[PDB]
Amino acid sequence: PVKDREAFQRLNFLYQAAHCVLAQDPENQALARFYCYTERTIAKRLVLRRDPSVKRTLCRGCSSLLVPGLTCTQRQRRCRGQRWTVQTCLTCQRSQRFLNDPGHLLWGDRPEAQLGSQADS
Amino acid sequence: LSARQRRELRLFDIKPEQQRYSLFLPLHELWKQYIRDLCSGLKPDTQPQMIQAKLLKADLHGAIISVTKSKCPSYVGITGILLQETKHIFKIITKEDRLKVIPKLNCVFTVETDGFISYIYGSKFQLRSSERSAKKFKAKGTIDL
Amino acid sequence: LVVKTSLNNPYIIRWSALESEDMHFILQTLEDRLKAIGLQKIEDKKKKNPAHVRKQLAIGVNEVTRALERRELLLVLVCKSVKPAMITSHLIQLSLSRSVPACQVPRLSERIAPVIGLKCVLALAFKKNTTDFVDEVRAIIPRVPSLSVPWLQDRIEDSGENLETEPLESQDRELLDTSFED
RNA sequence: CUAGGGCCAGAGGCGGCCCUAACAGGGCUCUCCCUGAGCUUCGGGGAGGUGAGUUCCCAGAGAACGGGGCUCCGCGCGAGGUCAGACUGGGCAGGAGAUGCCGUGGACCCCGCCCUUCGGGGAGGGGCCCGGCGGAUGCCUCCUUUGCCGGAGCUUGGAACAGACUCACGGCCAGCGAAGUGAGUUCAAUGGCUGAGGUGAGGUACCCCGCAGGGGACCUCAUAACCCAAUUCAGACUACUCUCCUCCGCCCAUU
RNA sequence: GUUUCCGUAGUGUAGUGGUUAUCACGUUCGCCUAACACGCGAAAGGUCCCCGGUUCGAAACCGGGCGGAAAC
Ligand SMILES: [Zn+2]
């Protein structure tokens, strides 16, 4: 994390720059796609382990980081057993499965909330 | 995965060309606070060799440029901030709405910081700028301009 | 020592203010209006043997998510009964364009049961364009607190950025999970 | 000494096709991946078969399989009530989505037409998944639950009918010291000079043809860079501009 | 003409059958001595010859371009 510390600033800058385009003018999303495509490529070559909370919004088909949150369809339904929150865009038509349930809040606090109590300085 | 990401293109359209270029200033304002958060020392005497070395791998998206030298006389003197950045071209948008494409073939760009001015010779800086931050910027040749 | 530096950015988009003195009696005001006008909602569904049915009461999660898309001025009421509800309720915060996302955390689960209705509804909303239902509820909308979103722009040409790098340690999960593969 | 050949084990042979004894050759074409300033029906680069093996740490049910974590389900097994539909009575499921509908999505099951009569190829339907739109009843008729067995899902991650790479798709056997290469040197010859042309710019007090135009004559200048034969030839790859042909991009200016 | 091998702090060289850059010499400092040669610890010092490509990540694997070296 000496030389790799510089690399963290170059990833969240292009992530935030795609939000500034869509905050001022929506329905023209070519800047939000390229800023996410450059963000994924730097993390692909310079290997970094990003959080699954942000990465589940990037919509790993090609690139859309903010587009399914305000334009596309994200709903709840029950396919076979437990209910699933299906995140599907309108460009590559790929889906991401995420189950929402009170029986597995202990496992729902396992990837994200366990690092909030164990990652010490 | 190759043609499926390239169905229409990731290219612009006709309607985002007229998005009132002064509204692209918070993209430049985001970049302006980004450089102050990168080195965090500017004023008294803080290593001008370090400033030109950290901008080698820095993502310069949304930065002001002005062509002071180019092999074409028509390319020299175009000001504006950039939006895309491809292999050996990068698309800029200028004053009152019109976009222009200037290639990175043999030219230099002038980037104005708060208290610094850095020239970027566009003949060595190419080859998919996401990979520019990764690796392989070595010492080769001169830039005869 | 196995320490992996992980860029972890859950930038906390906070909800409205937790004014328990203010957000308690306005829910009792909603019970005074939904009962005095009429309770013919269950009488048309069950048909225990039509003007109250004409409302577009967005009942459920997926009727609220389709409501805020096109062009609708409405009010959003979200409770917190699920602990991983931030996956679901992120659309309430992020779709702030023309609505007010009210979030009654401790009491809204106890507001469906006394009303003659159905089981525990998570997301409650209603479309009331070009129809005067209750003029007093429309006065509570500037009275409930709004939430600012620094995720996109927060309405001012001034960005909010941070550097949240949480280094993941393998020795912490070695004592919790105790999983070994050789 | 015809290697358009034989021998031992094999029986497998690199998408298909075509040209060549010049098969780490070229061309046509299909699919996929990587990638580029011609939205892209585009240019460039790489990979296609089968079998075996490998694929960091962490997270994750799982990175070969199985076991083990937890939920859901009953052509299975066991117990209790038997008070086995009463005013459709009883119980379960349901906005935390029941029911219904849509589809050039499936490498899923079945009916099944035609090419065919080995794997199979395409049109169409049902069931089961996938995804989308739209929101209220639906299920069973002695009943309910635990345990066991089977089936399905599982917020990870660069990746989970995978992809990438390595290895293997045979082994082995055949030469002549005799003069002199449209350059033939080997302590390693040879792309020379001058003058006149060609083509590519520029000019005319010059001539002819008479359509303002064109041709001829004369004068000035560019003709290179990369590089060197050593037995020879075909092909691939790489280093190139005095030049010509094809395909375009960017920006300036004009209408 | 012919064949194989090599390029790694300043030199000589390992290493890796792909995710970390180091051992010996020398320098600096430290240990030690009235001040020392040895022993010993530690630090400064990286275009891992160059580009492309494969892969999640090439000092490495592959392809090309040079370079260097061993001998008839
Ligand atoms: Zn998409």
Spell out where chain B is interrupted, by the residue before each break (C to N > 2.5 A). none
Check CB contact under 8 Å for A17 and B130.
Answer: no
Contact assessment for residue A66 and residue A20, using Cβ atoms and an 8 Å cutoff: no
- The token duo for A97 is 């499965």
Greatest Cα pair distance in chain B: 52
Which segments of chain B are extended strands (E)? 64-70, 79-82, 89-93, 99-103, 107-112, 117-121
* Ligand 1: centre distance to CA A21 (Å): 18
Taking the C-alpha atoms of residue C70 and residue C123, their distance in angstroms, rounded to an integer, is 18
Check CB contact under 8 Å for B29 and C157.
Answer: yes
Q: How far is CA A76 from the centre of its chain?
A: 18
User: Residue A17: which of A43, A39, A40 has the closest Cα?
Assistant: A39
* Ligand 1: centre distance to CA C130 (Å): 36
Which of chain C's residues have a Cβ under 8 Å away from the Cβ of A118? 169, 172-173, 176
Which segments of chain C are extended strands (E)? 3-7, 56-59, 74-78, 100-102, 123-127, 165-169
Taking the C-alpha atoms of residue A117 and residue A120, their distance in angstroms, rounded to an integer, is 8
User: Residue C107: which of C18, C32, C34 has the closest Cα?
Assistant: C18
Taking the C-alpha atoms of residue B56 and residue B51, their distance in angstroms, rounded to an integer, is 9
Q: Which DSSP symbol is given to B17?
A: G
Show Cβ contacts of residue C126 under 8 Å, excluding neighbours closer than 6 positions: C55, C56, C57, C58, C74, C75, C133
Q: Which DSSP symbol is given to C146?
A: P
Taking the C-alpha atoms of residue C78 and residue C61, their distance in angstroms, rounded to an integer, is 9
> Which bin fits B23, alpha (ψ -120 to 50), beta or left (φ > 0)?
alpha
**What length is written for chain C?**
182
Q: How many helices (H) and strands (E) does chain C have?
A: 6, 6
Residues 63-102 of A with CB under 7 A from strand E: none
- The token duo for A23 is 């905050």
Beta pairing class for C100-102 and C74-78 = parallel
Taking the C-alpha atoms of residue C37 and residue C33, their distance in angstroms, rounded to an integer, is 6
Count of Cβ atoms closer than 10 Å to residue C49 Cβ: 4
* A71-74: long-range pairs with CB below 8 Å, 24+: A71/A26, A71/C69, A73/C65, A73/C66, A74/C65, A74/C91
Measured to protein CB atoms, the chain D nucleotides within 7 Å are 32-42, 56-63, 70-72, 94-98, 129-137, 152-159, 249-252
Q: Is A88 on the interface with C (CB under 8 A)?
A: no
Show Cβ contacts of residue A86 under 8 Å, excluding neighbours closer than 6 positions: A74, A75, A76, A77, A95, A96, A97, A98
B80-91 residues labelled b (16+ CB within 10 A) or e (exposed):
bbbbbbeeeebb
Taking the C-alpha atoms of residue C133 and residue C33, their distance in angstroms, rounded to an integer, is 9
- Experimental determination approach used: cryo-EM
Closest CB to B37 among C153, C157, C161: C161
- The token duo for C141 is 């909308």
Q: Chain C: give the shortest CA distance to residue A42, in Å.
A: 13
Taking the C-alpha atoms of residue C143 and residue C30, their distance in angstroms, rounded to an integer, is 14
Check CB contact under 8 Å for A30 and B11.
Answer: yes
- The token duo for C95 is 């779709």
Contact assessment for residue A90 and residue C92, using Cβ atoms and an 8 Å cutoff: no
Show Cβ contacts of residue C50 under 8 Å, excluding neighbours closer than 6 positions: C40, C44
Contact assessment for residue C63 and residue C109, using Cβ atoms and an 8 Å cutoff: no
Greatest Cα pair distance in chain A: 48
Residues 46-75 of A with CB under 7 A from strand D: 47, 49-52, 55-56, 60, 73, 75
Taking the C-alpha atoms of residue C78 and residue C29, their distance in angstroms, rounded to an integer, is 17
Q: What are residue C121's phi and psi, to 5 degrees?
A: -90, 130
Contact assessment for residue A15 and residue B61, using Cβ atoms and an 8 Å cutoff: no
Show Cβ contacts of residue B130 under 8 Å, excluding neighbours closer than 6 positions: A38, A41, A42, A45
User: Residue A97: which of A83, A110, A81 has the closest Cα?
Assistant: A83
Give the experimental resolution in Å.
3.7
Angle at B96 between CA B94 and CA B97, to 5 degrees: 75
Which of chain B's residues have a Cβ under 8 Å away from the Cβ of A28? 12-13, 15-16, 19
* Ligand 1: centre distance to CA A26 (Å): 16
Closest CB to A14 among B19, B61, B83: B61
Count of Cβ atoms closer than 10 Å to residue B108 Cβ: 19
Residue type, A11: L
Count of Cβ atoms closer than 10 Å to residue A28 Cβ: 15
User: Residue C25: which of C100, C132, C104 has the closest Cα?
Assistant: C104
- The token duo for A36 is 């996410």
Q: A2 beta carbon < 7 A from strand E?
A: no
A72-107 residues labelled b (16+ CB within 10 A) or e (exposed):
eebbbeeeeeeebbebbbebeeeebebbbeeeeeee
* Ligand 1: centre distance to CA A63 (Å): 6
Residues 22-81 of B with CB under 7 A from strand D: 72, 74-75, 78
Taking the C-alpha atoms of residue B29 and residue C173, their distance in angstroms, rounded to an integer, is 41
* Residue at minimum CA to C1' distance from nucleotide D155: A98
Question: Element (H or E) spanning B126, and its range?
Answer: none
- Which residues is B102 bridged to in the sheet? B90
Contact assessment for residue A26 and residue A67, using Cβ atoms and an 8 Å cutoff: no
Distances (CA, A) of B69 to A46, B72, B76, B114, B144: 33, 9, 6, 22, 11
Q: How far is CA C125 from the centre of its chain?
A: 9
**What length is written for chain A?**
121
Count of Cβ atoms closer than 10 Å to residue A12 Cβ: 21
Residue type, B2: S
Taking the C-alpha atoms of residue B132 and residue B122, their distance in angstroms, rounded to an integer, is 12
Exposure of C21 in the CB half-sphere (CA atoms within 13 A): 0
